[PDB]
Every structure is written in structure tokens, then in C-alpha cells.
Scaffold this motif. Sequence first.
Motif, short mmCIF file in Angstrom:
data_model
loop_
_atom_site.label_atom_id
_atom_site.label_comp_id
_atom_site.label_asym_id
_atom_site.label_seq_id
_atom_site.Cartn_x
_atom_site.Cartn_y
_atom_site.Cartn_z
N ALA A 778 0.76 -1.30 -0.13
CA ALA A 778 0.18 -0.20 0.00
C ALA A 778 0.60 0.81 0.00
CB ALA A 778 -1.18 0.62 1.00
N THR A 779 0.82 1.99 -1.30
CA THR A 779 2.09 2.60 -1.06
C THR A 779 1.26 3.78 -0.97
OG1 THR A 779 3.41 1.59 -3.06
CG2 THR A 779 3.78 4.50 -3.67
N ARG A 782 -0.19 6.08 -5.14
CA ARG A 782 -0.66 5.36 -5.94
C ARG A 782 -1.60 5.09 -5.69
NH1 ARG A 782 3.24 0.53 -7.17
NH2 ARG A 782 5.14 0.73 -6.58
N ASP A 784 -2.80 1.65 -6.04
CA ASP A 784 -2.69 0.38 -6.33
C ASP A 784 -4.02 -0.57 -5.82
OD1 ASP A 784 -2.78 0.53 -3.27
OD2 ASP A 784 -0.31 1.30 -3.59
N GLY A 787 -6.52 0.77 -3.72
CA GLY A 787 -6.96 2.53 -4.39
C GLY A 787 -6.01 3.12 -3.44
N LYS A 788 -6.13 4.76 -3.39
CA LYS A 788 -5.32 5.24 -2.96
C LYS A 788 -5.94 6.03 -1.33
CE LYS A 788 -3.17 10.29 -4.52
NZ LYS A 788 -3.25 10.55 -5.28
K K Z 1 -3.02 3.00 -2.15
#
Ligand code: K
Length: 885
Positions: A778-779, A782, A784, A787-788
Amino acid sequence: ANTFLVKEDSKNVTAYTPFATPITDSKSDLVSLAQLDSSYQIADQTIHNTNLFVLFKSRDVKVKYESSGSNNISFDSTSQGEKPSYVVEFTNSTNIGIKWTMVKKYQLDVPNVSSDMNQVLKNLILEQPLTKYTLNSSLAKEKGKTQREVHLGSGQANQWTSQRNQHDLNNNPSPNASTGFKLTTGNAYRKLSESWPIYEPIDGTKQGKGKDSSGWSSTEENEAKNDAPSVSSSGTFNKYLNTKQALESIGILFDDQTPRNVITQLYYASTSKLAVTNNHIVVMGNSFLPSMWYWVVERSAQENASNKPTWFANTNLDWGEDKQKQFVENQLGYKETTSTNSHNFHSKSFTQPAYLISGIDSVNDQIIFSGFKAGSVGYDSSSSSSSTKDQALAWSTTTSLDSKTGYKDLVTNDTGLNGPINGSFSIQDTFSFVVPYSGPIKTAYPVKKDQKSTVKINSLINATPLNSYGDEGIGVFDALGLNYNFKSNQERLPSRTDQIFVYGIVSPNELRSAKSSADSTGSDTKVNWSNTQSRYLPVPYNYSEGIIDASVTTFSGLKSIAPDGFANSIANFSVGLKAGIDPNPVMSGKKANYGAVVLTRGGVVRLNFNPGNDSLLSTTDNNIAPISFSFTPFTAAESAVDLTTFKEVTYNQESGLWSYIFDSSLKPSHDGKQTPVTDNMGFSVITVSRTGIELNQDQATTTLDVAPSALAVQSGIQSTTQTLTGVLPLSEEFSAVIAKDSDQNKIDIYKNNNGLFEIDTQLSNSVATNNGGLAPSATENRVDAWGKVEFADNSVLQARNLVDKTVDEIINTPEILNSFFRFTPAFEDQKATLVATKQSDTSLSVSPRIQFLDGNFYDLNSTIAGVPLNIGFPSRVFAGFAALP
Ligand SMILES: [K+]
């Protein structure tokens, strides 16, 4: 348990998470764990109420059949031959991870043979198995004697109209109707103690030696070996195909280059599928070879007990109507008070002896099965002045044209009940292979009254759902379902002996008579399975080319254009029977709906049950075809699928969808022409969904007059380049595929776009980026797999005047804390919520709870098999809330 068990090889099973990552140390050599030697391999596995049940079979098993004395069938004890199959129950001993431990072990012993059974078994003969490369012409067999030749003999033709009444053939208009097929050429028929060859005749009407194993070993084997040599040389392949590798691929066992005897092949093939209930473990054969028995193992069986199988010949099924059962039984052989050494399944009062089982499953405590009836007829084994010497006795049982339009009427029609009747008929200018009419028109068994006691009619078993192989026109029409009536609404005339599909739901007490029948000493004990049925199911006629109407098209001249992996277009096949509970709720007071699906050549069959009393679904009108069976045709995309590469079938209760997995590595190494197979790469997934009006939805649907159906869709999940590891059906919207594009495992995510799965390359990349952990990372910046998440600044409190509210209040008001973040979903309708924790009297911390491709929510404290995932979601502290109100 949110885990997916993936069979990595013949011995190892690994547990996978929804993120397509393996649980650390979950990989288990279940062979070693079952305390079995290296020759054993996993044949099938199933989970039952939290425990794993594994069916194991050994490449080393050797079985003997001895015609003399008692206990005729026995494992070959000398050297490494006594290696029986086993069913093993395993439990998970840990609360953190997977640690499989063996609970129970069940030996699957060889069958008991009663005096009556051995009398049939001593001269039982079985056809060589059908392979991917068996041709229509390979299956074709020389036509037998006509009805006139058998009863009257060589003298004249015109005396038929006058002498038919003496031979009990009153008003029979067919003196030139074939009584069967010859067994002096064609595919090899071998006794239980003899072995099948690796060679298949190209034209069975000319090549091969049939049941003449002496002629095969003395002059024809040399001819086949020089024309069709095994690779190392480069042969001609003019007269025979060498299918050794295609035989090894369907489970044929070998001693170097020589297949083991028939009884060993039957044993090893028969221990292929399992289904588990609260009281039983049931083991059945595969859809490649006919099986003559099955096991009903009592789960209360004492350790080291030999669990005995039940013979199909002693298992009486309900074929729909008694006439349907009569049809099969009459064609099994000759029944006469005066026989001497003329013992066959009909003669010794047994029923249908073999089936090509599609599979088995269990819903509730009921067992579900389906399969095709394996062709079984009588043959003349007498030696010397016998009209039918070395001839199998088979004939067309297709309904006459004058028959009444209505299922009951059509299937109970007396046409071909006792003996031959169909062949060729020309009414004024219109032609038909089937009789136009039905004192009365009599049918009689093809044995003349004079040679009643001096004839030896024994039993044979075919490799396919075909009874008659005789190289004539009726056979192609019966095999492909091209016999229609000339009435107002053209109705397909059914056969009652060729391509007969079989299915049912078996109760715990019916399983108990079966176990009692297996353990019976002395005489045979009979089992009756009453919630069963049969159905004429021919192969699609469009898997063939250039067929003639009103010179006819026969098996030896029939052009196959079949795209489903078989070189033939005449013999039907089925694979992967799978039961499933419907997630769609039923009206209150009614029991949850369930069904089963199975794939056959050219379509999907849906099996319908009444959940109220676990019986087959039915309708009051006898004209309506039993509504327990529905067939839906495949389109070109599903027909292109090689059915012989079927890997596994799973069902998902949340979606109500069946997923049939096809693995191309399952293709044999070499051709029938000893050429290496190059398209052994890739995989394919067919999705099956229910269609039609379902039972107990509302007051009108409490009665049904139309069979609920299914639909198979070659739904976009496929590859021609990757080596499949496993398919994980996460949800209706997503599936995860683990495949090697080299030597290393890669994860692919396929998104369902209004019924059609397509690869999502950005989701695949997001889900595959896990840093070697169990779940996708989990960035912060981003969008990803998670989600965000964007958190509000601490100034959010002063902005919405939340500074007056206490931490306790904010925490106990979900609508407030969802204003602390902005969530960008990776896929449509992906949801997120915040989980709050009081940190001090003036501050709280929030952490997201985000939905993955599977539809479940994951947070900082999520586990799979008790193992913390440690996904790594962000946290956010918000301070400045009032200490006291
Ligand atoms: K994310």
C-alpha cells in the motif's frame, strides 16, 4: 477459509491466500505424510467440514485375474505389486499456518467375485481404450450377419415372409437388418488377464485383430510395429497409429513398453475420484476408461480394514421407465434356461456392468454422479458350424417413425427391444434407416432355436458409449442424433442403447445397501438406486462433415471436423461433474436450491434436484422430457477447448458459478504418428452459470414444467504461452492466475467486464508488487490494489467545529470519521472505511479497512490461516478534541 489449496505436483499441495501468495511452510508432501511410498500420487482431493480428504494411487500397482478357484481378482504380491489405493483424511493441527496431520487411512481393496460373477468374468472381453488420436474409422467394425442369415441360413431369401413366424419374428420387415459387428478385425478386445496393444488400427474394418489375440501376437503385431514404430524411429503410419504416449497420459500403466493387463488398468482407473459425506467416502473411476465397480467406505472403518468395492452389475439403476432398463439388459446378452457354458451379464441376471463416470460430488449428505453407459453386448465365442461365430450381437434401438410425440411414448417405444429391426427403408420416395411402423411387429435375439444349447454367448465391454460399431448408416445417425420423424413438428428419435447418459442423487441408506452388496459372501446381493435417470445424448452432428441422405455415410468413411481434442466425432464423453448450492435465496419455508453441472462434447449439461426431499426435479406431464436434465450447446469458443486437458472444476457459493480449468501440459508428449506435441503450453477457463426460471422463487415456481438450464462461456481467461500453477476465483468480478512465464511464478488479474474476463495489466502489477510479503503493498501516492487514501489535515476539526466533540463521541459516530479521508478506488465499487482508536483524552488514530478483489475487507489486524498479513495501511492521529463534554 479464505485460503486456496493448490496442487503444485503429484505429491505436494500448498495453501494460497486471496493475494495469490503461498502461506509460508504450507507446502506439504501429502504422499510422505500419508506414510505412502514414492510410487503413490494424488488422484483427487476434497475438503469436508474443515478437513482434507486425499485419494492416492500407485504407478507400481499390479492386479491378477485367475479364472480358477475363489478370490479371482488379487494384487500381484510378487515384487512391488501389492500397492492398493488409499483415501486419507488430514486435519490442520496448528492455529497459525498450515500443519497437515493424518487422522484416518482407508485401503481400497480389489473386488470380491461371487461364483455367478466369475462365470461371466472368465470370458469377459474389453475393448482397447479410446485416445485423443482414435479415428472414426478406428472404431468402425465389420458388419455382422443379417437377421435372415442367422435364423434361416444359406439357402434362399424369399422364404422370409413365410418362415419368420416360426423364429418368433412375426411381421418383422427386416431380414437384411445387421445382427452386429465382427471381432476378427478392428480394435483389440482382451480378457482381464491379457493386455491391450499400443497400436490402434487406422481402418478397423480392415486392420486390427479384434478379440483374436493369437493372430495379433502371431502375425499382426509385427505388421503394426514395422508400420507404426515408437520414437527413439520414423515410420509410415499407413495402417496403424502408435498411441503409447496418449495411453500413458490417460493413466495406462506400463512394464517398459508393454501395458499391464486389463484388470490392473481397470483397478487404477477406478480409483480416480472421491466425494465425502458425514458417514461415507465414495470412490469412482475416471471418464477415460469404463469402471465396473466403485467403493462406499464407511468413515467409521477400523484402521487396516480392506474396504470392498460394489459392482455396477449388482447396482440396479432407475433408467427412467422399466422399458429403458429392459432395452439395455436385453442387449447385454442371450438369456436361456439351456446355456451350458453360455454365461453373460443377462444370462446370470446381472444389470449394466460398466460406466464411463463424469465424476462425483456431495450436496447435503447425498452423493451425485453422472456418466455415460459403456457399451456392453453379447458375443459368440463358440469354436469348431456357428452362424455368428466371433461376432458381437448389437443392433439399433432407435424409436420407429410412427411413434407418438411425447417423451414417455418415444422412449418406451418397443422398436428393437429384443433384436434387430433398423437398417434401410424407402417409403415411396422418402428414405429412413429407422422402421416406419410399430398381429404385432416382433423382435427376437439374434440366435436361432436349433443352436440354442450349442451356442456360447459371452459378454463384452466397449471403450465408448456405443453398443453397435457395425460399419453401416444407422450407426452414424444413432451416434450423431440425425434420426428425426416426418411429422408436423420434427422430433429426434432416440436410441435406448447408444450414447446413453446416466445421472442420479444417492441417499446414505442407498450407500449402505451398496456397502452391504460389496461385503456379501456367497451369492450376489443387489443394490437399488431409485433417484437416478438416463438420457439419449448423441455427439453434435456438426463435429462431422459431408454426411449423405436419400451409398450411405458409415463410421469407416465419416469425416471428423471435431475441435475439442478428439480425432473422432462419433463417441461422446463427459468430464467434471460438480455440485453447487445456489446463493439466490428461495421463498421462506422452502429449502435452499442446488444443482450440478457437467461438460460433455458440444455442450453443458445441468442436473436439477428437488431440495425438499433430495430427489430429481420432475413434472406431472409424461410428454415433457424429465426436467431433471437440461443440455445447452457450446458456441465455437467453448467447442475449441480440448476436453481431454480438463484439470479441475471448482464452485464458488457466493457467485453461484462453476469454473472448469483446462491445462495444456496434460496433453501427451507425442502424436499417434509419434510426432512431438508442440501446443502443450497454456491453459483455459470455462465459466458455467445457471439460466432459466428456478424452483421455489415465488408461488408460481413451486411447480415447474420447464427444466432449469446452464451456460458454459470460454470467458477470456486463457494462455497459449504460460505454464499454469493455479486459478483462484476471487469473486464474480475477479480471478487471479498464478502461472510461470519462465521458471518463476507470475500473478495475473482478470477483470469481468459484463460477462467477459479480460486481463487487467495495471491491477496485475499492483497485486504482484508485494515485496515478498503475503499481500500487495500500500503506497501513499499510488492508486494501487488498495486504492489510494488521502487524509484530511488536522485543521479538519476546527473547520467542521468538531473541537467541541469528545474523542468518545467521534469514535461512536461512523459518519464523522469518514470525513477524515478521501478514497480513490482501484476498481469500481471498491469500498474503504476508517477504524478509530482513542490515543489520549484529546486524540485518536484512524486506519483504513479496505476491500480487496475478493469482496472482503482487510485492515492492520487481518489474518489468513491465523497468519497476520501485515498489509501496511497508513495510520493518522488527529488531536485537539475536547477532554470532557
Ligand atoms: K495506495
